[PDB]
Amino acid sequence: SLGFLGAAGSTMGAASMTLTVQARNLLSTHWGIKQLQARVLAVEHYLRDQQLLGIWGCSGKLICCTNVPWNSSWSNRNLSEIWDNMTWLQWDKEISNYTQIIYGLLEESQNQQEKNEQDLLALD
Amino acid sequence: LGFLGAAGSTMGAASMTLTVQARNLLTHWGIKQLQARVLAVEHYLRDQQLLGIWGCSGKLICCTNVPWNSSWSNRNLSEIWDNMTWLQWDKEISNYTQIIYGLLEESQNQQEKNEQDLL
Amino acid sequence: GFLGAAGSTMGAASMTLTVQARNLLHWGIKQLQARVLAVEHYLRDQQLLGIWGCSGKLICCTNVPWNSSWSNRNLSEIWDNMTWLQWDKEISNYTQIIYGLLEESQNQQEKNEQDLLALD
Amino acid sequence: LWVTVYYGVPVWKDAETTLFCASDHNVWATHACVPTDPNPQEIHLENVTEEFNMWKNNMVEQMHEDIISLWDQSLKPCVKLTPLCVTLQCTNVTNNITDDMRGELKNCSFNMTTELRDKKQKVYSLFYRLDVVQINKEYRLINCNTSAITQACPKVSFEPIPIHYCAPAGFAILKCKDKKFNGTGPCPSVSTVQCTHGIKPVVSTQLLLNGSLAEEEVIIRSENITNNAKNILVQLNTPVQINCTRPNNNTVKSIRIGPGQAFYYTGDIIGDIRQAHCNVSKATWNETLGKVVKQLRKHFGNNTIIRFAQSSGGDLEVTTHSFNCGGEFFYCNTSGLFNSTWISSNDSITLPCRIKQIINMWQRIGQAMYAPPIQGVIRCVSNITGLILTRDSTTETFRPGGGDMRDNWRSELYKYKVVKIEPLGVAPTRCKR
Amino acid sequence: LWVTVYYGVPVWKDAETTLFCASDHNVWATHACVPTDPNPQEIHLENVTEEFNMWKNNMVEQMHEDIISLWDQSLKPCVKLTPLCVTLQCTNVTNNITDDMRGELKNCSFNMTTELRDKKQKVYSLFYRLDVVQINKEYRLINCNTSAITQACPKVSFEPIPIHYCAPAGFAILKCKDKKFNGTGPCPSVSTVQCTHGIKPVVSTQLLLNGSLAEEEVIIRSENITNNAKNILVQLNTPVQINCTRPNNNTVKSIRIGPGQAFYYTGDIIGDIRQAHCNVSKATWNETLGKVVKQLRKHFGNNTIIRFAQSSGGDLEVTTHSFNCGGEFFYCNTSGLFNSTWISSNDSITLPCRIKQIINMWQRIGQAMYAPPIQGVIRCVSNITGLILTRDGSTTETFRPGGGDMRDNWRSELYKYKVVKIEPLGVAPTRCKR
Amino acid sequence: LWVTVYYGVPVWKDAETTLFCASDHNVWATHACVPTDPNPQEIHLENVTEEFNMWKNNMVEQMHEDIISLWDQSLKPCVKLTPLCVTLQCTNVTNNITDDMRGELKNCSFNMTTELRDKKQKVYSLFYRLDVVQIKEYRLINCNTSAITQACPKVSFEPIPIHYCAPAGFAILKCKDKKFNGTGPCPSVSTVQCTHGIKPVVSTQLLLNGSLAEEEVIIRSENITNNAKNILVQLNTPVQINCTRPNNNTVKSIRIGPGQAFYYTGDIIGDIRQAHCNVSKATWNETLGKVVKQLRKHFGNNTIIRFAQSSGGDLEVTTHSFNCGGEFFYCNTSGLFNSTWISNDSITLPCRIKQIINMWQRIGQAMYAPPIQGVIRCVSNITGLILTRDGSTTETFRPGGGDMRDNWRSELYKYKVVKIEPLGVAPTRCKR
Numbered sequence A: 001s002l003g004f005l006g007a008a009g010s011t012m013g014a015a016s017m018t019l020t021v022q023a024r025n026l027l028s029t030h031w032g033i034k035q036l037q038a039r040v041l042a043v044e045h046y047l048r049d050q051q052l053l054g055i056w057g058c059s060g061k062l063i064c065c066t067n068v069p070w071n072s073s074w075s076n077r078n079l080s081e082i083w084d085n086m087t088w089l090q091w092d093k094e095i096s097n098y099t100q101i102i103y104g105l106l107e108e109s110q111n112q113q114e115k116n117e118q119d120l121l122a123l124d
Numbered sequence B: 001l002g003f004l005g006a007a008g009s010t011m012g013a014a015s016m017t018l019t020v021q022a023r024n025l026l027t028h029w030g031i032k033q034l035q036a037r038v039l040a041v042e043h044y045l046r047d048q049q050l051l052g053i054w055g056c057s058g059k060l061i062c063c064t065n066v067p068w069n070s071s072w073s074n075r076n077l078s079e080i081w082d083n084m085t086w087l088q089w090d091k092e093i094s095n096y097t098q099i100i101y102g103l104l105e106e107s108q109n110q111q112e113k114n115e116q117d118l119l
Numbered sequence C: 001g002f003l004g005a006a007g008s009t010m011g012a013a014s015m016t017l018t019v020q021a022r023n024l025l026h027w028g029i030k031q032l033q034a035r036v037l038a039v040e041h042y043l044r045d046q047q048l049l050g051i052w053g054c055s056g057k058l059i060c061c062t063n064v065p066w067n068s069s070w071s072n073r074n075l076s077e078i079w080d081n082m083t084w085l086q087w088d089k090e091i092s093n094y095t096q097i098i099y100g101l102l103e104e105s106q107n108q109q110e111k112n113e114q115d116l117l118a119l120d
Numbered sequence D: 001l002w003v004t005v006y007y008g009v010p011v012w013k014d015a016e017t018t019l020f021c022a023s024d025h026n027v028w029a030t031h032a033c034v035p036t037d038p039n040p041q042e043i044h045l046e047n048v049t050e051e052f053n054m055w056k057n058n059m060v061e062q063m064h065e066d067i068i069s070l071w072d073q074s075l076k077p078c079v080k081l082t083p084l085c086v087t088l089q090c091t092n093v094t095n096n097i098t099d100d101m102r103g104e105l106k107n108c109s110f111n112m113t114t115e116l117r118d119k120k121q122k123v124y125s126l127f128y129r130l131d132v133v134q135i136n137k138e139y140r141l142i143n144c145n146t147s148a149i150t151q152a153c154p155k156v157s158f159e160p161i162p163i164h165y166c167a168p169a170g171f172a173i174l175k176c177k178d179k180k181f182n183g184t185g186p187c188p189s190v191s192t193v194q195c196t197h198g199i200k201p202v203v204s205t206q207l208l209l210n211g212s213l214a215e216e217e218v219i220i221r222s223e224n225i226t227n228n229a230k231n232i233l234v235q236l237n238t239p240v241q242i243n244c245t246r247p248n249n250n251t252v253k254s255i256r257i258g259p260g261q262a263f264y265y266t267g268d269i270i271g272d273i274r275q276a277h278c279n280v281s282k283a284t285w286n287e288t289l290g291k292v293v294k295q296l297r298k299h300f301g302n303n304t305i306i307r308f309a310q311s312s313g314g315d316l317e318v319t320t321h322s323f324n325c326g327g328e329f330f331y332c333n334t335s336g337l338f339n340s341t342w343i344s345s346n347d348s349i350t351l352p353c354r355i356k357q358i359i360n361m362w363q364r365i366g367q368a369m370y371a372p373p374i375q376g377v378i379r380c381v382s383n384i385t386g387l388i389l390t391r392d393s394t395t396e397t398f399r400p401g402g403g404d405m406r407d408n409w410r411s412e413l414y415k416y417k418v419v420k421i422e423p424l425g426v427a428p429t430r431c432k433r
Numbered sequence E: 001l002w003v004t005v006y007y008g009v010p011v012w013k014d015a016e017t018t019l020f021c022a023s024d025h026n027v028w029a030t031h032a033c034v035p036t037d038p039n040p041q042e043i044h045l046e047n048v049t050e051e052f053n054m055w056k057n058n059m060v061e062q063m064h065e066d067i068i069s070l071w072d073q074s075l076k077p078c079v080k081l082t083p084l085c086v087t088l089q090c091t092n093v094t095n096n097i098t099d100d101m102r103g104e105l106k107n108c109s110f111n112m113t114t115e116l117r118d119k120k121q122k123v124y125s126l127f128y129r130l131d132v133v134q135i136n137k138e139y140r141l142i143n144c145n146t147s148a149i150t151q152a153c154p155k156v157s158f159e160p161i162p163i164h165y166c167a168p169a170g171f172a173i174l175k176c177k178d179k180k181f182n183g184t185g186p187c188p189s190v191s192t193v194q195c196t197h198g199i200k201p202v203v204s205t206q207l208l209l210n211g212s213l214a215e216e217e218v219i220i221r222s223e224n225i226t227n228n229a230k231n232i233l234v235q236l237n238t239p240v241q242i243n244c245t246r247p248n249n250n251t252v253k254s255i256r257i258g259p260g261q262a263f264y265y266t267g268d269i270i271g272d273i274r275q276a277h278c279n280v281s282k283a284t285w286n287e288t289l290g291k292v293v294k295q296l297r298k299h300f301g302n303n304t305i306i307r308f309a310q311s312s313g314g315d316l317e318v319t320t321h322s323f324n325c326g327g328e329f330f331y332c333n334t335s336g337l338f339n340s341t342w343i344s345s346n347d348s349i350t351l352p353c354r355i356k357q358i359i360n361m362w363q364r365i366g367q368a369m370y371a372p373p374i375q376g377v378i379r380c381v382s383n384i385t386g387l388i389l390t391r392d393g394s395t396t397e398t399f400r401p402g403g404g405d406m407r408d409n410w411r412s413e414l415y416k417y418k419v420v421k422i423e424p425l426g427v428a429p430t431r432c433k434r
Numbered sequence F: 001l002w003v004t005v006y007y008g009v010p011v012w013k014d015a016e017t018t019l020f021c022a023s024d025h026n027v028w029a030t031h032a033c034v035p036t037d038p039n040p041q042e043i044h045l046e047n048v049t050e051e052f053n054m055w056k057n058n059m060v061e062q063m064h065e066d067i068i069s070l071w072d073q074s075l076k077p078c079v080k081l082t083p084l085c086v087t088l089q090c091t092n093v094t095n096n097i098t099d100d101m102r103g104e105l106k107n108c109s110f111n112m113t114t115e116l117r118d119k120k121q122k123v124y125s126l127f128y129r130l131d132v133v134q135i136k137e138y139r140l141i142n143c144n145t146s147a148i149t150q151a152c153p154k155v156s157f158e159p160i161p162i163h164y165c166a167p168a169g170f171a172i173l174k175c176k177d178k179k180f181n182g183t184g185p186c187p188s189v190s191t192v193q194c195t196h197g198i199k200p201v202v203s204t205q206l207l208l209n210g211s212l213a214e215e216e217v218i219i220r221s222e223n224i225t226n227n228a229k230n231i232l233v234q235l236n237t238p239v240q241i242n243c244t245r246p247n248n249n250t251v252k253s254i255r256i257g258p259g260q261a262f263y264y265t266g267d268i269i270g271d272i273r274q275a276h277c278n279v280s281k282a283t284w285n286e287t288l289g290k291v292v293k294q295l296r297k298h299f300g301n302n303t304i305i306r307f308a309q310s311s312g313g314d315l316e317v318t319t320h321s322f323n324c325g326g327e328f329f330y331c332n333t334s335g336l337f338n339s340t341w342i343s344n345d346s347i348t349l350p351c352r353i354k355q356i357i358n359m360w361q362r363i364g365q366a367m368y369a370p371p372i373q374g375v376i377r378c379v380s381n382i383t384g385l386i387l388t389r390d391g392s393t394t395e396t397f398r399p400g401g402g403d404m405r406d407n408w409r410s411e412l413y414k415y416k417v418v419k420i421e422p423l424g425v426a427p428t429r430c431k432r
């Protein structure tokens, strides 16, 4: 088995098997007051990630599929290359400037999905 | 558009703007900033915990089995979603929202019991 | 009385789980330490349950089998004549083991679901 | 029909919380307010009317406390002046007085300790008579029987720095821009902003200097205009320029009293000893005051006789216009501004000013500050942006003066209130689990 | 079977965390604590016997440490007596003496500072002997070679205010409600609260005042009852009424020391000069001991013979009854309370008592506080709710008053509490699968 | 393809965060830092090359600030010596002239109050020339600046390894590259939560009691071609240094106030001796040759490398200094930089004692270091050097004046702080 960041250097595909170790380690004399602030910051970072998963409807999951298609304008690469040659450190760099576009799309998609469910449920 | 862009608009219009509204949540004088940060967290978690209790966590909207009571208020849906804003609505329901919250907890408890009988 | 169930009569107590959870969450520094501690523990546990694929769910079943090394008990009194306390006293150090298995199982389950949807 | 849950609902409630300080060294220390401002813009809320009881906005109390906290923290590390409470030998400065400051300054001699305990030094210095009290030529400083005394650090300028205040997460600031609105009721034009505009920590009495100007017209604000005991707040739309100077060219001298601890004091005046004073344009003041009266007629009848007069009493800090000019404190007598009845141009109005060096700011006791002297001469140009006045039969008498600094803060903080975001709520619909 | 999980399960583990105060001008910053819950709840814990150990209870340690810290915060921000540490030129006060007061009150002159540092004030005041030591005529304050003395801040109250404590959420306070629980062990009748009953920070020794009473009978609690190095804690069922006084009509005087500061000096006495003393009911005290002795016999295992003797340590803080009456400090001679043996009107014993003005809380080093004098006549009353007694190293054992650790006053009131953390997660075998 | 979000993604962003203190009676209040894990996990990472720039490492700044704060906290509750700023009558101590006593140790007497405001005592004490100036009338140098405080006699000054830990959500990266110069990319990396302990050893000119280079001497600099930068040289071998103050000091103590006392040297037992440090000459000369061999790898092996002393500055700049046992020693380095390198062996360095301490290159503070009773013996390791390059065909190097941040920067060259970002996105075959 691997330690917490032992996934580094693995391919993006291989790294999908280390999602549990990465996620389970989140959140893991007045001059010491910074220690209180540090614990608080760890909490804030954690909660921000949880809210994002919430707004996209991906809460409680390590992986989540969508109803939003991928745009080649963000990145045009072979699927095989993405999962087998690229690692996550390299990959993130290729799509850094599209992060907010993607997030906006994911949230709006979820917003519409929930409304559609409510109407269907109301009908039957 | 924007944070509170729908404030003053109808409940219907505002029902689709829940996103941006939610997105805006979360040297001894310095204790103030620490405290402010902590409090923001406390308020956030109280809401998440309650939604958790009711089985509504993770979503902007949630459906229940609790019926609406005309004894609380009696306004038509044609008036509630179209001619009413959330600010005014919130005022109208301030007398009984807490009753509703208790009822929602009871309904979720029955559902979990029912799930347990099958499980 | 959020702890009205004493750990006794655990069977019946399984329906009070909701209730117990209801109160979750120089004096100035002490209050800060006290409140942040409540937050840390709350999140610690919610995080752990969430990684096992359950969230807001008081009781959930999974795809991990039960081992005889964990329990060779009668299995006939656990709700009616076994306290959650006494059982826990007799946890026999499998807490971490079980938790790891729960994560492994879920990891594979999520992957399987993703692959099925990919097949679509 | 079923009660369903909606989260992220755009509603709010009044709430008590503090505000992040962002500034963009000094007494309002930079390291105390590191945050700057990206300058995000606010959002207008269409169809929202908000009741702002501005008189009750507690953030004014917070400002009061924060400014004093910054004030005191910055003075804490400075050299203390305890050794100065000795018997002084004082006579008058009489040789170079221009027929005004008649015994205004004293020429004092005293036995001061020096850096080594075994050595003493004789010190000669000038004092304003306002800071020196006769013991029975035996004198003591006025604070020696009531408070501690600290020398302000020469590196702190005390020039007011505009601080915006920002809401914490989960909170927002409602800003109402409705024109010609007094600010206590259901103000119909509100936008939501995370931060207020910046307000300078100007300290003053009588007049309100360097604040926000009224849009369109002079406006009079009050909590209860009927009660003459409530202070009357007047906001001008057009500022009145005031030029305040100290004509005396001062020598600054220093000694070392303690272990590496210097003291700064007034030496001889180089030129003529002339009295400090402030000027305003004569017509501008008269036009401005008439405009105020026009507004009084909105609260008082058309034939009410409006009489302006100088304050009837109180100490110097109450009856004169007390302010910080270059670090020294001026006490200007506004009797030339308030001495008229309003029932139906290359010149000026000059007010005489007194100067004090021992400062007791915030009307507190047990603590005092010593303002080290300014080398050379002093010149300040300020904007009169408002007036704080009290009221005392077919006539009404108006006499200038206000209370503590909360009056100043309160007016600048107008148009804003702080509320908590309340995102959770329920409403009926057709969807049933 | 399969493994399933649960959240919100009613189980717990011992844990140590901090306590949060709740309180309802004073010296405990009571106004800095949250208001108390006017309507708290507790639950009987059904079918649980748990264990408590009052000698291992961190709650005791914390309340003790917190009062030390709090005391300093309350006392720190006021004027010192540094300029007052001068040679005193002393004679005895012999003007209005009962002859029990000989040498107790002294009259001394000295040269102290004023608002103007170049001027000095020749003043005089009165002293109580206990705080003054001869230099050789020439005297100094006892603490002049030991510690700085702070003048107690003048608008304070030292009358104990009960402070309630709350667990942080996720934790709970377990209370022992089992009558006649003697510590260190099983308690079959317990209840759980989020916030407990307040405890007054009473500081005294060899007599415990205004605490709790035993529900039915006197109980003795001791970490080791046969350890000759240990004390015993006595919880009485019957409070003993005690009446203490400073039978002198005092005046006070205030003279400036510096720039807005003054010292409160002793002034003089109106009427004559008299000794402080304390009264108790005689039979009540005798019956109280008979009950204590009965409990000790239970521990001995027979109707054995014991003696009650005098404390002998060379320290007022060890042998006298240390008591704060209003704002003044009593060091009473308790010898008339423990002068008997036990073998198988109510005119009081009027214990004579000495008054000290400069004190040293918790017997720590480098600190001291001066208690300003109080004008008028002082009278106070209290309920003796318990005792701290100890034992010596034959067939007859001797018991004596004792215990110099104020922490044990805290321990006694806290004898019934324990803190645990709640453990809401667990697993079980089941017939259910995903 | 479809957008897929992953949580638990192993990716990094460089970060500037606060540091957490962990440890295992002294000036650093180490008892206040939570105990460490004796066996932290170290995770070796494969196929990662990471840029570590020690000159941009903000952990150095945090150590600087925390160490200063601890230093001040240590002294804040200690007794003030303000009453000593009196005039003194002083003559030289000439009782035992061994020719070490070149006017350095003086016998001073003064009038000081004590216990009661009504009384004075005459105090006879010894002072070092470095801290005393003429007004037979003399004053203490510290009376120039703010009041002098006596250090507390029971608080030790021996450096204790301190572990710096990242907060949760963050980690500390370390590289294992040998011959790593602290500025380039380093391909062999691992992750730890906490650093190894680093002792807060304080010294100038010479870097004492740190880690060693692996195999070969490493020369680290921000700009190697500049003559306005310090050069930090890490040795791959220690050299032992034996320091002594061979005078048996009798320490006297007097009350000065309300439970307050002053500690000072009274009598001297034995003849007057000069303090000094001994380093092996042969060991040192080989060590220097190694350094020279490395300098030539940056500057060419067709030049000449000369060593000389620094020039200009105060005692704290021109001499070597260190604390040992609470005493502050200043040592001459002439024997260390008197050579030219062209393509019972021992060096004795004279040393002196200072009483008034002003460290951190600050002013407006002053501390008095009371003396050690008897004789102090001290042993230290040289683990590195601070070099200064000068501005035709040959060049000279001199010892640097020093900056305390360099000591920490050197030990921390191996570490970097990184933020872990568990969320990320990639395209997939899966849709819902």
Ligand SMILES: *[C@@H]1O[C@H](CO)[C@@H](O[C@@H]2O[C@H](CO)[C@@H](O)[C@H](O)[C@H]2NC(C)=O)[C@H](O)[C@H]1NC(C)=O
Binding pocket: A006, A007, A008, A009, A010, A011, F046, F047
């Ligand atoms: C780092 O790079 C090495 C290549 O040098 C990778 O090693 C290969 O891993 C595959 C399995 O994924 C094996 O089948 C090959 O035989 C390995 N190659 C060699 C030369 O042994 C390695 O997986 C990469 N990443 C990590 C995290 O180790």
Ligand SMILES: *[C@@H]1O[C@H](CO)[C@@H](O[C@@H]2O[C@H](CO)[C@@H](O)[C@H](O)[C@H]2NC(C)=O)[C@H](O)[C@H]1NC(C)=O
Binding pocket: B005, B006, B007, B008, B009, D045, D046, D047
């Ligand atoms: C504020 O209120 C006005 C009406 O008082 C809104 O203007 C109407 O908006 C609706 C929704 O688009 C239109 O159907 C109407 O035709 C508009 N005017 C009318 C009354 O015919 C305005 O949009 C509101 N602004 C918000 C969002 O607060």
Ligand SMILES: *[C@@H]1O[C@H](CO)[C@@H](O[C@@H]2O[C@H](CO)[C@@H](O)[C@H](O)[C@H]2NC(C)=O)[C@H](O)[C@H]1NC(C)=O
Binding pocket: D090, D091, D092, D102, D103
């Ligand atoms: C300093 O000048 C003042 C002002 O002239 C002197 O006080 C006045 O003395 C005259 C008599 O010569 C009185 O009629 C005035 O009423 C006094 N004025 C006030 C305000 O009391 C003062 O005596 C001079 N002092 C010294 C030391 O020269």
Ligand SMILES: *[C@@H]1O[C@H](CO)[C@@H](O[C@@H]2O[C@H](CO)[C@@H](O)[C@H](O)[C@H]2NC(C)=O)[C@H](O)[C@H]1NC(C)=O
Binding pocket: D182, D183, D184, D185, D186, D221, D222, D223, D224, D225
């Ligand atoms: C400030 O403006 C408000 C209106 O926004 C005035 O309030 C009204 O005052 C009248 C009396 O003249 C009352 O009968 C109304 O009921 C008040 N209405 C509201 C909404 O408060 C207020 O008096 C003005 N203040 C001053 C000092 O003039």
Ligand SMILES: *[C@@H]1O[C@H](CO)[C@@H](O[C@@H]2O[C@H](CO)[C@@H](O)[C@H](O)[C@H]2NC(C)=O)[C@H](O)[C@H]1NC(C)=O
Binding pocket: D310, D316, D319, D320, D333, D334, D335, D336
């Ligand atoms: C400011 O100047 C006015 C004069 O314009 C002073 O008014 C005095 O008022 C008293 C009554 O209280 C009269 O007896 C005096 O005759 C008035 N003085 C003059 C010169 O006419 C007022 O006292 C001055 N105030 C301050 C603070 O200096």
Ligand SMILES: *[C@@H]1O[C@H](CO)[C@@H](O[C@@H]2O[C@H](CO)[C@@H](O)[C@H](O)[C@H]2NC(C)=O)[C@H](O)[C@H]1NC(C)=O
Binding pocket: D249, D250, D270, D375, D376, D377
């Ligand atoms: C106050 O008077 C002094 C002289 O006593 C002025 O000092 C002059 O400063 C200028 C430079 O600014 C020099 O060139 C002069 O030689 C100085 N002496 C004289 C006599 O001018 C000082 O500038 C004056 N201050 C003010 C504000 O006028």
Ligand SMILES: *[C@@H]1O[C@H](CO)[C@@H](O[C@@H]2O[C@H](CO)[C@@H](O)[C@H](O)[C@H]2NC(C)=O)[C@H](O)[C@H]1NC(C)=O
Binding pocket: E092, E102, E103, E104
């Ligand atoms: C002042 O009081 C002291 C006691 O506080 C007197 O000294 C003692 O007096 C008693 C008799 O009352 C003797 O038995 C002791 O032996 C005395 N003590 C010592 C050390 O000798 C003292 O005599 C009184 N002085 C005056 C002038 O009244």
Ligand SMILES: *[C@@H]1O[C@H](CO)[C@@H](O[C@@H]2O[C@H](CO)[C@@H](O)[C@H](O)[C@H]2NC(C)=O)[C@H](O)[C@H]1NC(C)=O
Binding pocket: F092, F102, F103, F104
């Ligand atoms: C005390 O020591 C000082 C310093 O060594 C002596 O001062 C030196 O005296 C010689 C003459 O004997 C001069 O040539 C040096 O230049 C002086 N050096 C300094 C730094 O001043 C002093 O003479 C000695 N005094 C006694 C009485 O021995």
Ligand SMILES: *[C@@H]1O[C@H](CO)[C@@H](O[C@@H]2O[C@H](CO)[C@@H](O)[C@H](O)[C@H]2NC(C)=O)[C@H](O)[C@H]1NC(C)=O
Binding pocket: F181, F182, F183, F184, F185, F219, F220, F221, F222, F224
């Ligand atoms: C430390 O090593 C690094 C890595 O080699 C040096 O950085 C560069 O290295 C490349 C070759 O790997 C050279 O072409 C560059 O000129 C180097 N400089 C820079 C700024 O990138 C780095 O210069 C070395 N530093 C020292 C102190 O020798």
Ligand SMILES: *[C@@H]1O[C@H](CO)[C@@H](O)[C@H](O)[C@H]1NC(C)=O
Binding pocket: A093, A094, A095, A096, A097, A098
């Ligand atoms: C982001 O923009 C910069 C130019 O500012 C460009 O160099 C970089 O490659 C872009 N990154 C991505 C992922 O598009």
Ligand SMILES: *[C@@H]1O[C@H](CO)[C@@H](O)[C@H](O)[C@H]1NC(C)=O
Binding pocket: C074, C076, C077
């Ligand atoms: C315990 O196990 C035995 C079989 O070994 C069974 O007969 C008995 O009924 C079980 N106990 C209970 C309570 O069912």
Ligand SMILES: *[C@@H]1O[C@H](CO)[C@@H](O)[C@H](O)[C@H]1NC(C)=O
Binding pocket: D095, D096, D097, D098, D099, D271, D272, D273
């Ligand atoms: C002050 O003295 C100067 C000469 O030193 C003289 O020119 C000037 O007129 C004097 N002014 C007054 C007001 O006496």
Ligand SMILES: *[C@@H]1O[C@H](CO)[C@@H](O)[C@H](O)[C@H]1NC(C)=O
Binding pocket: D087, D089, D109, D110, D111, D122
């Ligand atoms: C200073 O003190 C001396 C006495 O030593 C006194 O004669 C003189 O008048 C004093 N001088 C001053 C200016 O106070």
Ligand SMILES: *[C@@H]1O[C@H](CO)[C@@H](O)[C@H](O)[C@H]1NC(C)=O
Binding pocket: C008, C009, E044, E045, E046, E047, E048
């Ligand atoms: C134990 O549980 C039973 C329920 O079966 C209850 O009747 C009984 O009172 C409990 N015992 C207590 C109160 O300790």
Ligand SMILES: *[C@@H]1O[C@H](CO)[C@@H](O)[C@H](O)[C@H]1NC(C)=O
Binding pocket: E095, E096, E097, E098, E271, E272, E273
């Ligand atoms: C108390 O003082 C009065 C005089 O005021 C005197 O008559 C009386 O005898 C004194 N009492 C004693 C005990 O000396």
Ligand SMILES: *[C@@H]1O[C@H](CO)[C@@H](O)[C@H](O)[C@H]1NC(C)=O
Binding pocket: E087, E089, E109, E110, E111, E122
């Ligand atoms: C006060 O000072 C004088 C000298 O001025 C001295 O004679 C007297 O004894 C002092 N007073 C006391 C009580 O020591």
